RNA sequence: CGGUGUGGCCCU
RNA sequence: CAAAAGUUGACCGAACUUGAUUAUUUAGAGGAAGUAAAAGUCGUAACAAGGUUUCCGUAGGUGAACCUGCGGAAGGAUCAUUA
RNA sequence: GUAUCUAGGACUACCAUGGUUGCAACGGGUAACGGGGAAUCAGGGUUCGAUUCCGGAGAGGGAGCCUGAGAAACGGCUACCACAUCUAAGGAAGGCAGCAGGCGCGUAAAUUACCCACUCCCAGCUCGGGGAGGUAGUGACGAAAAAUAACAAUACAGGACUCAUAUCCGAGGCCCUGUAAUUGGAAUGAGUACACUUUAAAUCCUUUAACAAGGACCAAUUGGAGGGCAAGUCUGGUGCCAGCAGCCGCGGUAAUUCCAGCUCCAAUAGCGUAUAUUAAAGUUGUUGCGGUUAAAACGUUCGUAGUUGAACUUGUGCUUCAUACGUAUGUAAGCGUAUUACCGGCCGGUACUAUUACUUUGAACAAAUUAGAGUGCUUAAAGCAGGCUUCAAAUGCCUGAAUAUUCUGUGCAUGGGAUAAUGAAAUAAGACCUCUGUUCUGCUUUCAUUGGUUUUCAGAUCAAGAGGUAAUGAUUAAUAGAAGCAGUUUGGGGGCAUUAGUAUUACGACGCGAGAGGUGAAAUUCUUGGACCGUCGUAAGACUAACUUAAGCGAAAGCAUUUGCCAAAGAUGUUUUCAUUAAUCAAGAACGAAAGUUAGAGGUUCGAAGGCGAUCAGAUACCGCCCUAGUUCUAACCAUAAACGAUGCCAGCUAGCAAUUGGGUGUAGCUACUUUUAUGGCUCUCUCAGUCGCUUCCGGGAAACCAAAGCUUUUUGGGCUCCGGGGGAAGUAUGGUUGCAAAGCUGAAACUUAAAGGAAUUGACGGAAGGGCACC
């Protein structure tokens, strides 16, 4: 069964590079997943995405211009205030330099040096490098 | 394959640790409760017990080796103790049914050189310090 | 998938994009809901009464050309009755396992089968009991099997 | 295609 | 008028004496397992095809190790053609 | 209703038949007073916290109670009970878990001190008093500070240095560097003691006159020194002795581990022992492992309590400016609209809002401790002191004693509208902003005061319009799932009739002749006239071979004669229906070949056990001969197997290649003749469910092996359950629970052990395979 159709949407994306797959076939069109995929395109880390949208649930294709190294995700959505934001970069960056985690406080989804201007306590989806 | 990440599962997951808490057979050395049990002297640091008899061990093999142990009884529970004397000589300085006092002896309690059954190591006897006597630091009263 | 089984198997329909055509069907949503009133009175099944519409006329789908499902399509003319039909299958389904386990016996592997339209009834009509479409205090009983589909 | 058990303990 | 001693009703209830009951301990003639077993006696099971191929759910039996029958498995020695 | 200062099943009486629970309730168990708090690192912590602070409790065991505002008080009393007091024998007295003492006890712990100066308290009280509180003697439990000399040439060895000379070589050597009981210069303060100081007084600390080192004194060790793990293959001694030693192992006559000496090292006023505890230990784990086999998935499928759940449910823009720098956009307003109703000058006050979880800023909320801002107590550990042209007067202002985390949490405001569910309008509310009633509940004001009488008002709420504008009110059916189906069907799946096929077993009869069977070999056994043999024939019960597959069906165990029957499932087929009906799962309910029992059948092959022949040293066995339990089918009863693919189940992606099962589909295929056709067969093409096999990671593992055992890599995450932490103790005890039994779901402990094993390489061209050699 489909538990978490965010999750499962994420790993795709990471079982394409590896032999190559410049492209993506993906389900199933949610808004949440549409708040998230230009976060990738917001510092440009996959290529061309679309979506078709049959009248059942809608389909993605993804282009790929092979940047990445792995996109993750925590689950479920942990609930996580500001002052403690700071132990879920140690635990899943590589460093303080590049990569970002994600998570989306009530009001919306962002980065968390984003969130870490906006100033607002929220749950994580996931993260990626 | 398993580990249960459910959110709402903490009552759960409490509950599966202490149902598994003794598995981890070096973990019921105080949680089950035996330490006033079979700690053959109770469970405190040494034991100030009184001299039975010497008895004559022999050591693990291949190595035939005499280790000339003793034979202690104890005032705070009543049994009956193995122990076992270094730096040969010292006999001399037994004089049987001594009041001795019997510390462990460095394992946290098994057979450890090749002597089996002696749980023990003397430091102390007749309240005059064991240690110092071969090195005749301290005199040794005799009677 | 395939609850009752190894199987990963999938089988279904495959419903097309649009929600007007046919448009050159000349065939309206009002003689449709007079064949229903003409064909579903003489004790036809939801489903049935939906595949008798497909072979014949032949309107693909009448939820384009009417908005309603079609139990609706059955109550907004008053047709639907007291017992929901997909139970009514299996019920029926369970009281045939009455009738070749009442003698022949042994049959543990037909016997493994009561266990599970037992189960196919009571999974399946913990749902229906909430949605209000049968009452609560509605207890399967081993008689009942006979009467409640006959 | 016939049988056939046992080898005191310790030596870079 | 106040008013001691003596005391009826209770009222809570010390302690006294049985019975049952909770766990920690405790004797015990014989019974029966474990390891210590290494200088003991009788065999030779298992490991090569261990010289009778092994192996488990159970039955029945002999000093034992085991053997024996039914139903299986490859940790087998057969990944195997063989018209 | 009683009592009680008062709630009250507090408790009496009358009444009802309830509170509570797999969201571990009631039951026991703890070497368990809670807590503020304490110790260790990267976090998450696991341990504890008796003990100065706070709070709740007890004064031997227990229990009543006076007095007072206030005890169920014990440095108040009473009882009894325990253990002890004195007595003239009539009586009286008793709790140190207050202080300092002893006694006992156990590894285990201080003076029978001084003082009310401090801090607080007591009352009639400035004054009295307080082993509160302060100080001292006790104390290597601790923490902080820091003495063992410093300096000189010669010296004696190494080096640079100048230089002879250079595979060599020395001297000018020498800042240096050592050894120097060589020589010193002796720098000094602990000890030392006037006086002083501080103190209730006194000591001690600081200050200090007089004292104070050629060391032998004014004198540091404790443990090591084979490897771990730092540093003598020095010596004597010793000979598997004594020992050593956490482990690995050293000692068995020329010892790197023993005993000494030797030097070397370690940390240093501290080292060591044992003992619990955390770290090491990512070997208690969510982060953070493991399950093919190294320890390890219930055999099984459903199945509630669990727990986790699809998608879909108001916004990009449009214009301008603040604004980065013609450009950008991260800014606010206008503009695709409750951007709320009113009075105010865009701007104050007021009408006035489906919730949670979550997060926002917070509020409230002892310190002390932790962190710590300040801060030269001589420094530190402290501590909150003190700093200050003031130098010649001090009037000399202040800084202070902050700030948040453990002051975790729940809950009590506020911001915010993502996520996460909940939440309307389908036996009918779609609304009426409302003059609003075709309801009625009136309700208080003016009728100076007051009501009989009724309207405005109806503060209004409850009928109520045909004041019905009403897009009037129903999300897609998920490569979610379930049901449906001329449906075409499939299969050794089941049930249940009915049925076939050779053997074999004797038997029957004929035939013929003395052998038959069996073994490595024989023997046990059959046979004079008729076995074994040939032959027909009668039954008889078991089995359903061949066809049998790296086929298929089933959930797994298992499951093969025909044919009918009675069903049920899976798969494709589907512009059927349904509207999340879901996945997996403790407890639990159906099913599990035999083996194996419980009565009742039916008896063929075979067959544990039991006899007998060989074989052997023995055979109680491997081989034979006989039959016995039983396999058989009916009725049930245990329910375990290596019940194995030694790998649970459902969602997704990632690689081919080749078979083949079904179902579809295209032959722009043949073939078949009923005819070129038709249904039909095969071939090709496409297709889903695959399942097998093979290929190579280019994945993953410790490897063989693996397309999933991969995606558990980056100290990682798609869900849910059991379930392992070294052996052997041991799947044994002890009870429960279940069985008619044999037995199962269940499952430990003292003790004992340093390894048991995981794949792989090598020794076996060590009676084991394949191929080749000499009269060892």
Same mark, same amino acid.
């Given at each position: 069964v489909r538990m978490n159709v965010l999750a499962d949407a994420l790993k795709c994306i990471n079982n394409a590079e590896k032999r190559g797959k410049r492209q993506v076939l993906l389900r199933p069109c949610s808004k949440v997943i549409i708040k998230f995929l230009t976060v990738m395109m917001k510092h440009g880390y996959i290529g061309e995405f679309?979506?078709?949208?049959?009248?059942?649930?809608?389909?993605?294709?993804?282009? %790929?211009?092979?940047? %990445?190294?792995?996109?993750?995700?925590?689950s479920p959505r942990f609930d996580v205030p500001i002052n403690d934001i700071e132990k879920w970069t140690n635990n899943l960056l590589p460093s303080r330099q590049f990569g970002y985690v994600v998570l989306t406080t009530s009001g919306g989804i962002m980065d968390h040096e984003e969130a870490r201007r906006k100033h607002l306590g929220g749950k994580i989806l996931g993260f990626f490098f | 394959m398993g580990k249960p990440? =459910?959110?709402?599962?903490?009552?759960?997951?409490? +509950?599966?640790?202490?149902?598994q808490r003794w598995a981890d057979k070096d973990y019921?050395?105080?949680?089950? =409760?035996?330490?006033?049990?079979? +700690?053959?002297? #109770? #469970?405190?640091?040494?034991? $100030? =017990?009184?001299?039975?008899?010497?008895? #004559?061990?022999?050591?693990?093999?291949? +190595?035939?080796?005499?280790? $000339?142990?003793?034979?202690?009884?104890?005032?705070? +529970? =009543?049994?009956?103790?193995?122990?076992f004397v270094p730096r040969d000589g010292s006999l001399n300085y037994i004089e049987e049914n001594d009041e001795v006092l019997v510390a462990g002896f460095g394992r946290k309690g098994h057979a450890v050189g090749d002597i089996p059954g002696v749980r023990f190591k003397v430091v102390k006897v007749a309240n005059v310090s064991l240690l110092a006597l071969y090195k005749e630091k301290k005199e040794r009263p005799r009677s | 998938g395939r609850m009752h089984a190894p199987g990963k198997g999938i089988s279904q329909s495959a419903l097309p994009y649009r929600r007007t055509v046919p448009s050159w069907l000349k065939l309206n949503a009002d003689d449709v809901?007079?064949?229903?009133?003409? &064909?579903?009175?003489?004790?036809?099944?939801?489903?049935?009464?939906?595949?008798?519409?497909?072979?014949? /006329?032949?309107?693909?789908?009448?939820?384009?050309? *009417?908005? *309603?499902?079609? &139990?609706?399509?059955?109550?907004?003319?008053?047709?639907?009755?007291?017992?929901?039909?997909? &139970? !009514?299958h299996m019920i029926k389904k369970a009281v045939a396992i009455r009738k070749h386990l009442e003698r022949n016996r042994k049959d543990k592997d037909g016997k493994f089968r009561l266990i599970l339209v037992e189960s196919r009834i /009571?999974?399946?009509?913990? !749902? !229906?009991?909430?949605?209000?479409? &049968?009452?609560? *205090?509605w207890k399967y009983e081993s008689s009942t099997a006979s009467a409640l589909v006959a």
């Amino acid at each position: 069964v489909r538990m978490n159709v965010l999750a499962d949407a994420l790993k795709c994306i990471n079982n394409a590079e590896k032999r190559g797959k410049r492209q993506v076939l993906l389900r199933p069109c949610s808004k949440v997943i549409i708040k998230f995929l230009t976060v990738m395109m917001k510092h440009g880390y996959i290529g061309e995405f679309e979506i078709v949208d049959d009248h059942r649930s809608g389909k993605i294709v993804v282009n %790929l211009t092979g940047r %990445l190294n792995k996109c993750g995700v925590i689950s479920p959505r942990f609930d996580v205030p500001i002052n403690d934001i700071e132990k879920w970069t140690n635990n899943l960056l590589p460093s303080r330099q590049f990569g970002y985690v994600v998570l989306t406080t009530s009001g919306g989804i962002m980065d968390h040096e984003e969130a870490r201007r906006k100033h607002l306590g929220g749950k994580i989806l996931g993260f990626f490098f | 394959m398993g580990k249960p990440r =459910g959110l709402r599962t903490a009552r759960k997951h409490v +509950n599966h640790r202490r149902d598994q808490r003794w598995a981890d057979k070096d973990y019921k050395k105080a949680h089950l =409760g035996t330490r006033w049990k079979a +700690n053959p002297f #109770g #469970g405190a640091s040494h034991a $100030k =017990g009184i001299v039975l008899e010497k008895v #004559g061990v022999e050591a693990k093999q291949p +190595n035939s080796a005499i280790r $000339k142990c003793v034979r202690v009884q104890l005032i705070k +529970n =009543g049994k009956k103790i193995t122990a076992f004397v270094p730096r040969d000589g010292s006999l001399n300085y037994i004089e049987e049914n001594d009041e001795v006092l019997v510390a462990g002896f460095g394992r946290k309690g098994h057979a450890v050189g090749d002597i089996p059954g002696v749980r023990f190591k003397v430091v102390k006897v007749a309240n005059v310090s064991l240690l110092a006597l071969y090195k005749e630091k301290k005199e040794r009263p005799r009677s | 998938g395939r609850m009752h089984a190894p199987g990963k198997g999938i089988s279904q329909s495959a419903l097309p994009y649009r929600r007007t055509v046919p448009s050159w069907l000349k065939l309206n949503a009002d003689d449709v809901k007079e064949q229903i009133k003409k &064909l579903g009175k003489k004790g036809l099944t939801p489903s049935k009464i939906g595949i008798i519409l497909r072979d014949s /006329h032949g309107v693909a789908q009448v939820r384009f050309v *009417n908005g *309603n499902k079609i &139990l609706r399509i059955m109550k907004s003319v008053g047709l639907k009755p007291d017992i929901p039909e997909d &139970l !009514y299958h299996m019920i029926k389904k369970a009281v045939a396992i009455r009738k070749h386990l009442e003698r022949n016996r042994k049959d543990k592997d037909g016997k493994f089968r009561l266990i599970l339209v037992e189960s196919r009834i /009571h999974r399946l009509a913990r !749902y !229906y009991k909430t949605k209000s479409v &049968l009452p609560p *205090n509605w207890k399967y009983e081993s008689s009942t099997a006979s009467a409640l589909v006959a």
